């Protein structure tokens, strides 16, 4: 199977990136690009050979490919990997964002750049493993391993303007939030493994076997909450979001960590792949609380974004507001909302990526991220201001940008299940418009509010233009023709939706 190589190539390339700095400080970047290019090519090959569009839901579990190798036999833990329309779509996004993460940090050719790329490649290897792992321990291991590289990238290669103290403070907060939450999930994985043994007599960590574990209402609820705590920190779900704005602000200014370790939806997939299938009844009775937490994140994130001054922290809070819609959808039991969640998870990744990459490029010219020191940048630059407007139009969810397809599909499906929550949630589209236009008016429109913004700035390079324009084409195509993506995730999302509904009944 090739599934194992979607995780190995990134890891092997990371080692090569470090061992090739001896041939020059301009070599590691090419090794990283080839590494991510090969993983992306392999992902596309799997897409063109799986016939996902013609796969009909046969019921969980339903994998197009699977690999199993003994890892820790004593505990029945193995390297079990499996692909599906949902997982495939998340792996190809990781490959695309990984190539862009390498291209964005291309002018960074300082010493120890090999270790930078090693950490970047390993963050991506872990993310791909999280989307492929079907062994509960492998899932947890990949969930927690990807955090160590991220910690050192935010603390040692973080915002060039921030002091070491501020960067470390942010990295520690991110790690403690995430590793501790992940540990609460291990406690629940271990409890599920023991409840299975006691109820049946088998010792397994395989998701396929633990899918129907006879358990009481109380234990199922506690086990479900344990997984949710881990998926609430990475989504994020308010009030476990404080770590996000800080990490984004102190992360490599170029935007590499932002795209690789913060824009891949490993928590939304986790809620759809494990929480909903493993604990169907508990998820159904927690739906009200989860959906209301999402509504709060929609308005709280929007208000927090409006008052940010820092452009990168503004974009960071917009993510909390947008992910609230996905949380509401995951707990509706509607195929339309689930399919829309998949589109939004992909669209937000592309729209947020563009904003984060453009933010880094802007810093390279004005050496500031404070919007109070910008203004009239539309008349001082050649592309950045116009392209930032596009990504903000997509962020507010303009029809024709792909973010609209996901957001409206979620609302249409959610309305059929929870009408009142859908009505209040739709008003979030007005708040989005407020923060989206606020950022454009406070940075590119009006008059220069500082001297640096009052001089013609260097123009965007071909590399910068290519990566940003690629994201523009993808968002527009996803907005006008989203069917090819919907046809790939239909079987997987159908299996999950049926399981949840049928199990609750």
């Amino acid at each position: 199977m090739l599934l194992p190589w979607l995780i190995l190539i990134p890891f092997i390339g990371g080692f090569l990136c470090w061992q090739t700095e001896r041939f020059g400080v301009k070599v590691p970047r090419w090794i990283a690009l080839i590494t991510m290019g090969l993983t992306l090519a392999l992902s596309l090959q799997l897409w063109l050979q799986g016939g996902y569009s013609l796969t009909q839901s046969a019921g969980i579990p339903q994998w197009q490919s699977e690999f199993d190798m003994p890892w820790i036999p004593r505990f029945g833990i193995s390297i079990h990997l499996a692909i599906d329309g949902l997982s495939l779509l998340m792996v190809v996004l990781t490959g695309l964002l990984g190539v862009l993460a390498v291209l964005c940090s291309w002018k960074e050719i300082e010493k120890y750049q090999g270790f930078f790329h090693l950490n970047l490649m390993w963050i991506l290897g872990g993310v791909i493993g999280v989307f492929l792992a079907i062994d509960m321990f492998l899932f947890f291991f990949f969930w927690e391993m990807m955090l160590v590289p991220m910690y050192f990238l935010i603390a040692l290669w973080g915002h060039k303007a921030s002091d070491g103290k501020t960067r470390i403070t942010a990295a520690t907060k991110f790690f403690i939030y995430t590793q501790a939450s992940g540990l609460v999930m291990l406690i629940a994985i271990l409890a599920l493994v023991f409840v299975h043994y006691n109820a049946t007599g088998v010792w397994t960590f395989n998701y396929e076997e633990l899918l129907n574990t006879p358990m009481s209402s109380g234990v199922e609820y506690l086990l479900m909450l344990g997984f949710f705590i881990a998926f609430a920190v990475k989504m994020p779900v308010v009030p476990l979001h404080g770590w996000l704005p800080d990490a984004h602000s102190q992360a490599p200014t170029a935007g590499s960590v932002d795209l690789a370790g913060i824009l891949l939806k490993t928590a939304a997939y986790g809620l759809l792949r494990f929480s909903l299938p493993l604990f169907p009844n508990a998820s159904a009775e927690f739906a009200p609380i989860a959906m209301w937490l999402g509504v709060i994140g929609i308005f709280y994130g929007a208000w927090m974004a409006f008052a940010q001054t820092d452009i990168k922290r503004l974009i960071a809070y917009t993510s909390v507001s947008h992910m609230g819609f996905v949380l509401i959808a995951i707990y509706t039991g509607s195929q339309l909302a689930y399919q829309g969640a998949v589109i939004q998870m992909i669209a937000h990744g592309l729209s947020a990526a563009g904003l984060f990459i453009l933010c880094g490029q802007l810093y390279e010219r004005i050496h500031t991220r404070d919007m109070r020191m910008m203004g009239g940048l539309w008349s001082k630059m050649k592309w950045l201001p116009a392209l930032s407007l596009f990504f903000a139009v997509a962020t507010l969810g303009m029809p024709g940008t792909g973010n609209f397809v996901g957001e409206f599909m979620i609302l249409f499906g959610s309305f059929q299940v929870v009408p009142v929550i859908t009505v209040i949630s739709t008003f979030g589209l007005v708040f989005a418009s407020v923060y989206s236009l606020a950022m454009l008016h406070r940075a590119y429109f009006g008059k220069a509010k500082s001297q640096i913004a009052s001089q013609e700035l260097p123009g965007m390079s071909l590399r910068e233009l290519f990566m940003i324009l690629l994201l523009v084409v993808l968002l527009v195509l996803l907005g006008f023709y989203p069917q090819p993506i919907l046809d790939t995730s239909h079987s997987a999302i159908g299996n999950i939706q049926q399981w949840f509904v049928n199990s609750v009944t």
């Binding site: 009030p239 476990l240 979001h241 404080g242 709280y300 208000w303 927090m304 008052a307």
Partner: protein, 55 residues
């Protein structure tokens, strides 16, 4: 009102309490050995007392 993310400050209480508790516990770390000996005396009484009330 929300400009400073109030809910984040609320989730920072677990860390303010931790630092405070650490400083209070370190107050028992006075280099005085006679106190260290008294600490073991107090511990012995507590352990033996609990063993008798939980017997």
């Amino acid at each position: 009102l929300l400009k400073r993310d109030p809910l984040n400050s609320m989730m920072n209480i677990p860390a303010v309490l931790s630092r405070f508790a650490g400083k209070g516990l370190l107050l028992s770390e006075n280099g005085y050995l006679r106190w260290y000996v008294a600490s073991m005396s107090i511990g012995a009484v507590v352990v033996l007392a609990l063993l008798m009330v939980l017997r």
